[PDB]
């Protein structure tokens, strides 16, 4: 720009000039490789790799590193890179949004990037909207990579665990985003490492970031899986339970246990035909609803923990006494207390994990995507991302005639116009392309050709091979093709046989999107490189994007001054509301994005120490170290509310405390009255930890010295996975019914904060206290085998805009 | 922790660890400095300033640069810093929060950083919360610091542009956050470059962030100036405008220009006695009221461009047929129109000047800032400012004893057991400390232990000189001191003459504030470092912090349940209720400042430019440049409305053009038809530039060559600086203005974002605009002199929390 205004334009002046003078250094050594052998060139790789290893950084070797992969497609393609392209590789390398307009060679651009990144090994994913685009580029672009010397890989869902293993295992991996997110999904509920098929998130080069960073990300990434219609389960254990009443099926008051060791409820249980005494398998599974329906009768009183009703129950926030949203009680309760209260006990399917789009690219070391239009929402990348939106420069001047958008005061008024448009273009060999935004829309003209007589094709995105194919060519002279929604971006449409004089493409909008940045990559179809072309947008105020600015009031002015007379019309003042329409909605999609993410951030952080936690599990050759220090946790929880502030030391009811610990971690008589006497309760830690340290190595030595090790692996696993798929679908059940009744003026988002938080540590109580609880008192017979806790199968999806 | 959830430490347990090695490091050496002489150390910081020269880094010289200080304060205090204040010193240094509980030294801890830093020249600022703690700081911290040879300066407001100059002159200088901010906003409000007091920001390490940052930054600074009863002007203008209607007064419809320059309008016009025709005198200032009354008839229609009110003239946005919320019309055009209208013509004061603590000290090259409670707020500071909160370890294993509240029914029987716990203690020795909330709980209990005969000192925060003094011996035998939300806040209290045995402080606090973080720092004031202490808190069922959190429910309990009887109780869960009651609150207030920034983000992408522009201007030795530079880009922008959307090229109506620009930028008969036929809009700009460039040479030799200087530097500061203050009145208008009618389901931000930005090009069109149509057919008289556009007085302030 002239004048001061300028200044907008100075942080991306300084920066798209180091591009431009590098770019320069390697046109600079065209020479040192451009003549040498194809066996010499490959061998740069090597040297690239050694010369890496002694301590050089991807910086350093980007010049040469972009000198060879420069050789390597024009000896592989026939393509020598300009020096644009250049430019946008290294905005890539230096972590940024390359915004290369439609038909710079985007494809090819990413090749030298990702070259340089991928020689330390570490892999480098390259990233797309769909399956055949990868398999395209994968395909088209591995021949250059593979010719420098370099392993190319494709992640497709039709493949198997080994499969995808193996395309990760490649320096470089193509896929989508759909199959990169739910492989790191799946990824973290694997039950053994070997399982895993990827490897640690390196680097990954979006391609059509918009799209996907953007678009595809309105929603998360879900992963469900339904319940085996265990009704029966629930019932028969809230009946049972309730016969048992004695204090020999002893509950706490300083804890709330309803403890069923006591052999009333351990002779009269297995009198349930628990196939005898089958600890291991029985209790993790059944001894767990029992203790659940157990606690619903003695502990959860009903109208003072929670609360009956038509639609299901309540919990009860205390203090406040309210109605608490949409929230239920952890591992199966909710369900034995609507037993117990008789309730419709709801089987629903459970959100098994989650993670947003988001979050997942958020995870690379170095992030990096590129597109053609992406200025339009810098702001976003910059926040969402810290990706800043670099505008490369065009190779040849751009000479397409954009059209000022023409309005029409009636759509069957618009749409015969559009109809006749193309017909002039189609009776003067020009090849036009129409642009619709819906099906209908669509289908619409197409009849309206058809009538007309005007030979097309229409795109209505389904096996996008097969509209790749009709896309290129329309571009020749009896070019009429119809696109609903961009169908075939990616695939450039070259400039027909003799179709240069008979000026350019000449694209029409049959309406505007809901963002510029789409119908701004309908205009980018034609002018490719310095190509003529006309882009006509056509608008009427009917159109759903009009009928939505609240514009009645204009609808006016044009009625009550006989205006839908002289019917074509270039408004710059309409127009310009057009955009500020669009940009109002970009943004209300924004902050909707910007609200996901936010609410998936209190997931995030909890995934951090879960998925870590589990994954420590998955490789503990010394796993017991984490055991003992998880029960010596939830010994010390249990000091700790026997012993509470200060409340008269030796008189804190040292008694209760030894009846428990007793009958908790130990095995009755072990743990008395003198033993724990005018200690502070970090004493009484360490004497108490200590025995059940020993009796510890009792089991170690009695029940098998390594299958231990597996046994602590097999329980530490049961309850990390169990607690957390429940505790996710509570999760997720609560970001979506905490938006119900919350007029505690708070931003409702705090409230999902402070409870999903507040939960979540219970959880870890309950898994610290489960594992503890089991590698005591639990026994072995049969197979120590790792069980998955997934109950059939599972279904991996991404809502619909919701 | 223990379990699981130890993992939330980790990415705080790895950073600590490299603090607690490199503490290591610098105990290892004590040794060599410890037996040196005390001018062989000076030279250490020479010696360090050269090393850097020569390519070093802060970071490689920080152990020596810390042993050098540790060793210059024991040598200047008698204080050999422990592992833990370097630890804290480092955390600095890496531009984090040291939380550092109160009573380990943080005073001493910023020298190490502080001097580190400061070596470069660069210059860093100490900062804090008033006058008071600044002087004492960099009195007894000077002394350290000026031994190891480095000047230190001191910022208070008393100072004269000279003083300050000379302060920030320094390689260190303290001052309060209010002082540091105005400095910068008055900065760039300066006439010519030397008046300016600051020097580049570079790193301010700020002394209880948690007060700074967040309690005092809830609202902006800002800097009004009153306009002059200029009534009498506008109306006259208004007046005297219509008259003049002719076509001889030349208007426009592809532009809206009331062009006055008609000799009707140009002798008529005088006729007003305008002291004849002294154009740079009046023309700047007068004949700026014109062109907008000017405009005001010819241009703006009544009930279609704006709409006349009781609650004066509004504005209807096109297209929507709205009601411009708050917004104004620019340069005083909207005052025109009042008084064309006859409307109330508002002459309120203007916000000259404005800027956020956020947006100010996220300015510097470093920030990092300490406090003894921080981890509070640490979402905050990772979130506004990417410090991350370091917990620093204690010197000494604390052993204070800190109570759960004690809850009570009533205010009067609650405050009444404070007053009894004071005297049990003052009737034992121990100096107790009871912090109220508010100015009437102080003097309440004032009263309450004067009644029952209790020697006692209040402190209700004035001149904190005679406070801190009070403070500091509120830890002896007879200590009974009484502060109002922490009124001596840095001083610290040490335990006083045989109050050891007499147990701790004991502290009371009268009842909890709106943030743990301050009810944490009335516990922080006892136990300084290893010492005994009782930290007792009381709670009330009527305190506004209960009444507020919604908790009738629980008042109800307690009297349905004869509770008010057995008062004095201690319940874990009503406890818990209130710091989550806390969480709400300062998350409330989070939100509150997380909007406010957002807002202010508006503003600063557009203090970028104009700031930087102005800056560039008030260094002017070769101006001109920039000048043709705006004035092509005024020209080209005719040139545009001249031969819109291809409209016909020679057939744009190439004639009015030529009519305009002949009495725009030129005199009447310069460019015609001719000249101007058969061109693109393009190859027309430099032709008519040429000549534009022609007339500015004619008039570099014919007025004098350089003072030409000065006069592009008048008239272009004239220009910005009366366009910006307006825009940022009109901008600090509609902040406040927009909260008001907005269904467009937008949230109201994106508003102020889009009309905000909009004004500003606006703006720069004007200045661009004003600033070449001065440099051409303006006149000089006496003296160009550059002249200060704000009027009469100012005022530097912070607005209470509204």
Same mark, same amino acid.
């Given at each position: 720009m002239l004048g001061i205004l300028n200044k907008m334009f100075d942080p991306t002046k300084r920066t798209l000039n180091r591009y431009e003078k590098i770019a320069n250094d390697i046109d600079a050594i065209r020479g040192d490789y451009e003549n040498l052998s194809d066996d010499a060139l490959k061998h740069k790789t090597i040297e690239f790799k050694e010369r890496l290893e002694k301590g050089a950084t991807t910086d350093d070797l980007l010049v040469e590193a972009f000198a060879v992969v420069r050789e390597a497609s024009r000896r592989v393609t026939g393509m020598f890179p300009?020096?644009?392209q250049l430019m946008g590789g290294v905005a890539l390398h230096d972590g940024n949004i390359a915004e290369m307009k439609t038909g710079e060679g985007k494809t090819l651009t990413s090749t030298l990037p990702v070259y340089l990144n991928?020689?330390?090994?570490?892999?480098?994913?390259?990233?797309?909207?769909?399956?055949?685009?990868?398999?395209?580029?994968?395909?088209?672009?591995?021949?250059?990579?593979?010719?420098?010397?370099?392993?190319?890989?494709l992640n497709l869902n039709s493949m198997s665990k080994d499969e995808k293993r193996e395309a990760?295992?490649?320096?470089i991996t193509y896929s989508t985003n759909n199959e990169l997110g739910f492989d790191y999904l799946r990824d973290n509920m694997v039950l053994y490492k070997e399982q895993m098929v990827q490897r640690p998130l390196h680097f990954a080069v979006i391609d059509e970031v918009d799209s996907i960073l953007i678009d595809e990300a309105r929603t998360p990434l879900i992963i469900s899986g339904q319940a085996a219609k265990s009704t029966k389960l629930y019932v028969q254990a809230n009946a049972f339970v309730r016969t048992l009443k004695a204090e020999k099926d002893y509950t706490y008051d300083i804890k709330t246990k309803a403890v069923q060791l006591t052999e009333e409820g351990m002779t009269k249980a297995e009198k349930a035909f628990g196939i005898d005494n089958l600890f291991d398998v029985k209790h993790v599974a059944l001894n767990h609803h029992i203790n659940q329906a157990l606690k619903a009768h003695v502990a959860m009183q009903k109208d003072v923990d929670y609360v009956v009703e038509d639609g299901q129950v309540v919990i009860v926030d205390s203090f406040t006494g309210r109605l608490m949203k949409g929230r239920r009680y952890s591992e199966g309760l909710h369900q034995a207390i609507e037993a117990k209260e008789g309730l419709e006990i709801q089987n629903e399917s459970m959100?098994?994990?989650?993670?947003?789009?988001?979050?997942?690219?958020?995870?690379?070391?170095? %992030?990096? &995507?590129?597109?053609?239009?992406?200025?339009?929402?810098? !702001?976003?990348? #910059?926040?969402?991302?810290?990706m800043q939106v670099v505008t490369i420069p065009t190779n040849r001047p751009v000479v397409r005639d954009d059209r000022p958008d023409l309005i029409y005061r009636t759509m069957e008024g618009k749409f015969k116009a559009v109809a006749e448009d193309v017909?002039?273009?189609?009776?003067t060999g020009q090849p036009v392309l129409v642009g619709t935004v819906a099906v209908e829309t669509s289908e619409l003209i197409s009849k309206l050709l058809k009538n007309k007589g005007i030979p097309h094709q229409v795109l209505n995105a389904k096996n996008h091979e097969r509209e790749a194919q009709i896309i290129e060519e329309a571009g020749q002279k009896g070019a009429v093709t119809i696109a609903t929604n961009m169908a075939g971006r990616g695939t450039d449409i070259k400039l027909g046989?003799?179709?240069?004089? %008979?000026? &350019?493409?000449?694209?029409?909008?049959?309406?505007?999107? !809901?963002?510029? #940045?789409?119908?701004?990559?309908?205009?980018?179809?034609?002018?490719?490189?310095?190509?003529?072309?006309?882009t006509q947008f056509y608008l009427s105020m009917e159109d759903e994007l009009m009928r939505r600015f609240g514009a009645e009031r204009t609808m006016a002015m044009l009625d009550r001054f006989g205006m839908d007379d002289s019917t074509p019309i270039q408004s710059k003042m309409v127009s310009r509301a057009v955009e500020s329409s669009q940009k109002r909605v970009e943004g209300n999609n924004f902050d909707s994005r910007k609200q996901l993410l936010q609410y998936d951030d209190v997931l995030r952080q909890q995934r951090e120490v879960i998925y870590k936690q589990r994954f420590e599990v998955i490789d503990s050759e010394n796993l017991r170290e984490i055991v003992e220090n998880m029960i010596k946790s939830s010994l010390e929880r249990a000091i700790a509310a026997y012993t509470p502030r200060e409340e008269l030391p030796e008189e804190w009811k040292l008694d209760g405390l030894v009846d428990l610990i007793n009958t908790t971690y130990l095995d009755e008589g072990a743990l008395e009255k003198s033993d724990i006497f005018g200690k502070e309760p970090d004493e009484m830690l360490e004497l108490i930890m200590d025995r059940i340290i020993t009796k510890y190595n009792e089991k170690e030595e009695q029940f098998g010295k390594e299958q231990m090790r597996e046994f602590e692996k097999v329980i530490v696993l049961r309850a990390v996975d169990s607690k957390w798929m429940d505790h996710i679908d509570?999760?997720?059940?609560?970001?979506?019914?905490?938006?119900?009744?919350?007029?505690?003026?708070?931003?409702?988002?705090?409230?999902?904060?402070?409870?999903?938080?507040?939960?979540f540590e219970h959880m870890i109580e309950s898994i610290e206290d489960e594992v503890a609880k089991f590698v005591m008192k639990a026994e072995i017979e049969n197979n120590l085998e790792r069980e998955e806790v997934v109950q059939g199968q599972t279904t991996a999806h991404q809502p619909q805009e919701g």
């Open positions: 300009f020096k644009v991928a020689l330390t090994g570490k892999g480098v994913h390259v990233v797309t909207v769909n399956e055949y685009l990868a398999s395209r580029d994968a395909e088209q672009m591995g021949k250059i990579f593979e010719f420098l010397g370099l392993t190319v890989g990760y295992a490649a320096d959100t098994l994990a989650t993670i947003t789009f988001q979050n997942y690219f958020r995870m690379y070391e170095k %992030l990096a &995507g590129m597109t053609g239009t992406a200025k339009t929402e810098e !702001e976003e990348f #910059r926040n969402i991302y810290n017909a002039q273009r189609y009776m046989e003799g179709v240069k004089e %008979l000026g &350019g493409l000449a694209v029409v909008g049959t309406e505007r999107h !809901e963002s510029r #940045r789409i119908d701004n990559q309908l205009r980018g179809r034609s002018g490719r490189q310095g190509d003529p072309g006309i509570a999760m997720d059940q609560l970001r979506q019914g905490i938006h119900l009744r919350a007029y505690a003026q708070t931003n409702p988002l705090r409230e999902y904060q402070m409870e999903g938080f507040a939960m």
